[PDB]
PDB file of C-alpha atoms and ligand atoms in Angstrom:
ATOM      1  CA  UNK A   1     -18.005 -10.335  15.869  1.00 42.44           C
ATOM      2  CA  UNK A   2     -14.617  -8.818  15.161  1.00 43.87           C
ATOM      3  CA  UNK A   3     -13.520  -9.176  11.782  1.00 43.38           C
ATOM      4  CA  UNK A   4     -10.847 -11.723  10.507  1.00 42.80           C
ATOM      5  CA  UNK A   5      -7.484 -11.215   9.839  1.00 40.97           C
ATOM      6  CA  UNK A   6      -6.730  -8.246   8.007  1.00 39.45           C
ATOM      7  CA  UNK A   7     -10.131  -8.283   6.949  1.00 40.73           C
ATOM      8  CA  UNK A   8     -11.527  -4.658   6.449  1.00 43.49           C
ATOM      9  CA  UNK A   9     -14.797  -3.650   8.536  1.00 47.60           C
ATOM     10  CA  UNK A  10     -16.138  -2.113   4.870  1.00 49.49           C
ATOM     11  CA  UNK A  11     -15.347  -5.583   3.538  1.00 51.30           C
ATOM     12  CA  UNK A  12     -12.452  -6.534   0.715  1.00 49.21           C
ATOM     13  CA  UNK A  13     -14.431  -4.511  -2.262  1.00 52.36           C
ATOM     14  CA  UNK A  14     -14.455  -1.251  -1.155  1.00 50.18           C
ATOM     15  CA  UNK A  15     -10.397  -2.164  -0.613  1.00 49.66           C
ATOM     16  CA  UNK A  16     -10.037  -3.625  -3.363  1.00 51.07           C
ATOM     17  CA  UNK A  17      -6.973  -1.795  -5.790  1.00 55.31           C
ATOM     18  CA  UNK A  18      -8.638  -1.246  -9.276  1.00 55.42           C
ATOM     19  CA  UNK A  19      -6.680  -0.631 -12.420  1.00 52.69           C
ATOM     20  CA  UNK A  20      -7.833   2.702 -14.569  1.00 53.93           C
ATOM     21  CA  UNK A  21      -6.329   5.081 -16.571  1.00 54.14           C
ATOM     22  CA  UNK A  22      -4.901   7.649 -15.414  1.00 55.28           C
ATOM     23  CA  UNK A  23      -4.043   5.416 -12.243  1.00 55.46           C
ATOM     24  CA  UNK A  24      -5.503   3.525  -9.352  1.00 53.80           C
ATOM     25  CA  UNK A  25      -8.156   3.923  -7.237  1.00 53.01           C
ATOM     26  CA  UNK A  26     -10.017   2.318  -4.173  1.00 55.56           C
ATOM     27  CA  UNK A  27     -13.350   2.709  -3.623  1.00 56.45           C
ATOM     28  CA  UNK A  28     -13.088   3.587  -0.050  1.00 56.48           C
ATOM     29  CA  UNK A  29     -13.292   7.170   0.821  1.00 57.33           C
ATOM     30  CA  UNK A  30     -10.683   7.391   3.680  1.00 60.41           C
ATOM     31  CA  UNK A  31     -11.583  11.042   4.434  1.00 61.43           C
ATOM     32  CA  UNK A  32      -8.583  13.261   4.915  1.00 63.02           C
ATOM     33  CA  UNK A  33      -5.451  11.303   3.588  1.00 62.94           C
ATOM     34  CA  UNK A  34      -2.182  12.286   4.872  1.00 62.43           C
ATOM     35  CA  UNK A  35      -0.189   9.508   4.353  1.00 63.36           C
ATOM     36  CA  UNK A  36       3.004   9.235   6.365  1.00 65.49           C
ATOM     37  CA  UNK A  37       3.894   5.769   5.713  1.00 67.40           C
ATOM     38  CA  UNK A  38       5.333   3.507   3.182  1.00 67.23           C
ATOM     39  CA  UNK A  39       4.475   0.079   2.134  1.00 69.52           C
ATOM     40  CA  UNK A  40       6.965  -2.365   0.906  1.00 71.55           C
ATOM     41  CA  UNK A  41       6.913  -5.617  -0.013  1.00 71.14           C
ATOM     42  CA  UNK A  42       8.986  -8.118  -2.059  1.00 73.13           C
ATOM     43  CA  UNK A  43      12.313  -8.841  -0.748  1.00 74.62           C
ATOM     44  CA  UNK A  44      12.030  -4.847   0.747  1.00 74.60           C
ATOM     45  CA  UNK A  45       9.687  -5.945   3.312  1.00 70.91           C
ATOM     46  CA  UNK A  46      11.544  -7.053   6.047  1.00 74.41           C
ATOM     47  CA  UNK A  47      10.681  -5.332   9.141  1.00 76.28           C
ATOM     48  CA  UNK A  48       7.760  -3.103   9.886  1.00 76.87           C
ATOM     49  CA  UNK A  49       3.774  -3.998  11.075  1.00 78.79           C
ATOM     50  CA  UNK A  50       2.148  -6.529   8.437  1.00 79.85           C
ATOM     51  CA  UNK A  51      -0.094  -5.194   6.061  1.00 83.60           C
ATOM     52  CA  UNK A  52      -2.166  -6.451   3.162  1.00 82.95           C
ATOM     53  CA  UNK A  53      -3.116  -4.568  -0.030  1.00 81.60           C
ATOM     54  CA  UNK A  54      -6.200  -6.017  -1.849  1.00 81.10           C
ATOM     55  CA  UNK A  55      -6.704  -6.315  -5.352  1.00 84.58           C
ATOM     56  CA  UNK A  56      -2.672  -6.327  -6.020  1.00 82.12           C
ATOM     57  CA  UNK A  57      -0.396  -9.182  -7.467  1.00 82.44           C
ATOM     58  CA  UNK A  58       3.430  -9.352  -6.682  1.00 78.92           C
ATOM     59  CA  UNK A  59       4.909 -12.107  -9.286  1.00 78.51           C
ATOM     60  CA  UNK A  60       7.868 -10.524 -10.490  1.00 78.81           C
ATOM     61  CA  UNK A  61       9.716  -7.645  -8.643  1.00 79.41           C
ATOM     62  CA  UNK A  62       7.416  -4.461  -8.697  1.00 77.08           C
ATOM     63  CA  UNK A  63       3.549  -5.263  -7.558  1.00 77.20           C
ATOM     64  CA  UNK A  64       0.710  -4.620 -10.811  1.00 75.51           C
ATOM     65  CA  UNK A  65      -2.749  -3.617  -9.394  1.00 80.40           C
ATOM     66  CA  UNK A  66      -5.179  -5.951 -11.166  1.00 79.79           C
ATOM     67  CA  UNK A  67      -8.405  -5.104  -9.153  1.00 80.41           C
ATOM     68  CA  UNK A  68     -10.071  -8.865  -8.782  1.00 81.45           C
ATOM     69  CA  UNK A  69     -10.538  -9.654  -5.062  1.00 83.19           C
ATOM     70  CA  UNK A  70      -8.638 -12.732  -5.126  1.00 84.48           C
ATOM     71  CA  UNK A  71      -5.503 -11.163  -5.963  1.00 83.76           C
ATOM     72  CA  UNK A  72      -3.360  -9.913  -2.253  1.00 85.48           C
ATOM     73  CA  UNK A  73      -0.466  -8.314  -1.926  1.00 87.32           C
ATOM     74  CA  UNK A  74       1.155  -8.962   1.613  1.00 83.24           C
ATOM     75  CA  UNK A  75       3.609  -6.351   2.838  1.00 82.95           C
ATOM     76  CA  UNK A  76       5.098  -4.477   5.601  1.00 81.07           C
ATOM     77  CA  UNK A  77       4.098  -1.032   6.794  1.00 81.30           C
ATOM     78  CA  UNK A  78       7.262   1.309   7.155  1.00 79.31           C
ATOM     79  CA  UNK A  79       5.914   4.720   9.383  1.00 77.22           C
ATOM     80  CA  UNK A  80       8.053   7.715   8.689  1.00 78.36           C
ATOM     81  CA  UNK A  81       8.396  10.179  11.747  1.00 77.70           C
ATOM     82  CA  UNK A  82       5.809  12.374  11.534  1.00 74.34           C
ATOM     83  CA  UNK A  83       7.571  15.892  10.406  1.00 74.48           C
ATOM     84  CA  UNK A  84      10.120  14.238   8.247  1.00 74.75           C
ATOM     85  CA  UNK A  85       7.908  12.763   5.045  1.00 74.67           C
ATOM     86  CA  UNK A  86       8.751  14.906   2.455  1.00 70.92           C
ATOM     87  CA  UNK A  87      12.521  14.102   3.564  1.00 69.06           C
ATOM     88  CA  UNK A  88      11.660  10.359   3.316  1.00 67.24           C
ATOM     89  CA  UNK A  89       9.334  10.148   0.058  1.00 66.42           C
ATOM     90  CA  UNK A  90      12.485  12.103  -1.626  1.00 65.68           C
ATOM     91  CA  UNK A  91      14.526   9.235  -0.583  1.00 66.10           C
ATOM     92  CA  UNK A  92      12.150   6.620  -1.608  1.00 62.50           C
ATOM     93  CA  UNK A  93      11.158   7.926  -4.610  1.00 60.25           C
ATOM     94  CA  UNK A  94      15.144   7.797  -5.844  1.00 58.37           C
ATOM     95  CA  UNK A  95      15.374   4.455  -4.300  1.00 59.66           C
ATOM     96  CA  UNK A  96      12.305   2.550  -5.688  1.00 62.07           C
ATOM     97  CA  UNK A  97      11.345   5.050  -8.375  1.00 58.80           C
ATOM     98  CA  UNK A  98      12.625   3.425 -11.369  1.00 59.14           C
ATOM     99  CA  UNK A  99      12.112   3.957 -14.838  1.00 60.13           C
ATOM    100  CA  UNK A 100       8.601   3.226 -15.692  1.00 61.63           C
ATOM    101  CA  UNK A 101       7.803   2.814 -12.248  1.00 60.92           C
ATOM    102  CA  UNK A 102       5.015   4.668 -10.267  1.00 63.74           C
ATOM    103  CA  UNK A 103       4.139   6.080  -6.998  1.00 61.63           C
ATOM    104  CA  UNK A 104       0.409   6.577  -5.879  1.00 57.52           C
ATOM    105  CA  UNK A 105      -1.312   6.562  -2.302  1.00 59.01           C
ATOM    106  CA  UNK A 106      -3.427   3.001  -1.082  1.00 55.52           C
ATOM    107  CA  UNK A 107      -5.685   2.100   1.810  1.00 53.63           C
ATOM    108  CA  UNK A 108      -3.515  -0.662   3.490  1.00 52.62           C
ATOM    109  CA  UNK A 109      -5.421  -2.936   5.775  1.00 53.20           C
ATOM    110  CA  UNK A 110      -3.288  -4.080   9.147  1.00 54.25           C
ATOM    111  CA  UNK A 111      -4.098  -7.499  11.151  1.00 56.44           C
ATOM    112  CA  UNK A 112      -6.918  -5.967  13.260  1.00 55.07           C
ATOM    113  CA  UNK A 113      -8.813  -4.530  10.174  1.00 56.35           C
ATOM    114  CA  UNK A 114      -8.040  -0.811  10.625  1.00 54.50           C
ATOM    115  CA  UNK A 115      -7.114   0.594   7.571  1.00 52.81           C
ATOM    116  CA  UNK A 116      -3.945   3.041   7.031  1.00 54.79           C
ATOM    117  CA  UNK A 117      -3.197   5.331   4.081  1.00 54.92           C
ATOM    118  CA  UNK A 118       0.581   4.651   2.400  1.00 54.52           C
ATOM    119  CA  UNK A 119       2.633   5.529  -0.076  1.00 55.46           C
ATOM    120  CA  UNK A 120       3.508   2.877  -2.749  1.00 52.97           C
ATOM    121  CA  UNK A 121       5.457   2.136  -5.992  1.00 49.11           C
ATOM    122  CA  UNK A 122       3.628   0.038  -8.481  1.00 47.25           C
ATOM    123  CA  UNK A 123       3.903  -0.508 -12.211  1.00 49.23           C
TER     124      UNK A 123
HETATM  125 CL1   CL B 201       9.081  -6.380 -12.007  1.00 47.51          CL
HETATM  126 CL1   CL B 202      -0.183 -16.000   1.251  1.00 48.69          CL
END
């Protein structure tokens, strides 16, 4: 009984992006995150492995995390080479990292249900 597309063995909830305070969180417990990927989306997404981000809208131009399971985010994962990610997330950051925009760290979920840990901008 493998799970669906993109469907999380933990199931969507514990994937689920959820607004709060001081910033977002997922209730998922990855253990050990050392994220060496970015997800994009949006026009930005354009090559990369497929990956969804649950509890996220995209309607404008930067994605809002509104933590209700029907809201998906659809995106591509961009993997960094492994020693060069502080290199990279310097680059990103001055290349998505607008004013008022924000970085944090998700639980992406790719077609076969595995779950990866990226960075992402968000607002
Ligand atoms: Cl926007
Ligand atoms: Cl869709």
């Amino acid at each position: 009984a493998p799970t669906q597309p993109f469907v999380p063995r933990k199931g969507i909830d514990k994937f689920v992006v959820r607004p709060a305070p001081v910033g977002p969180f997922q209730l998922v417990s990855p253990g050990v995150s050392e994220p060496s990927t970015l997800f994009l989306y949006g026009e930005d997404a354009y090559e990369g492995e497929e990956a969804w981000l649950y509890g996220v809208k995209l309607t404008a131009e930067v994605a809002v995390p509104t933590g209700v399971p029907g809201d998906v985010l659809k995106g591509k994962l961009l993997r960094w080479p492994s020693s060069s990610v502080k290199e990279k997330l310097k680059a990103a950051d001055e290349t998505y990292m607008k004013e008022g925009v924000k970085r944090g760290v998700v639980s992406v979920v790719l077609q076969d249900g595995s779950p990866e840990q990226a960075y992402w901008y968000f607002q």
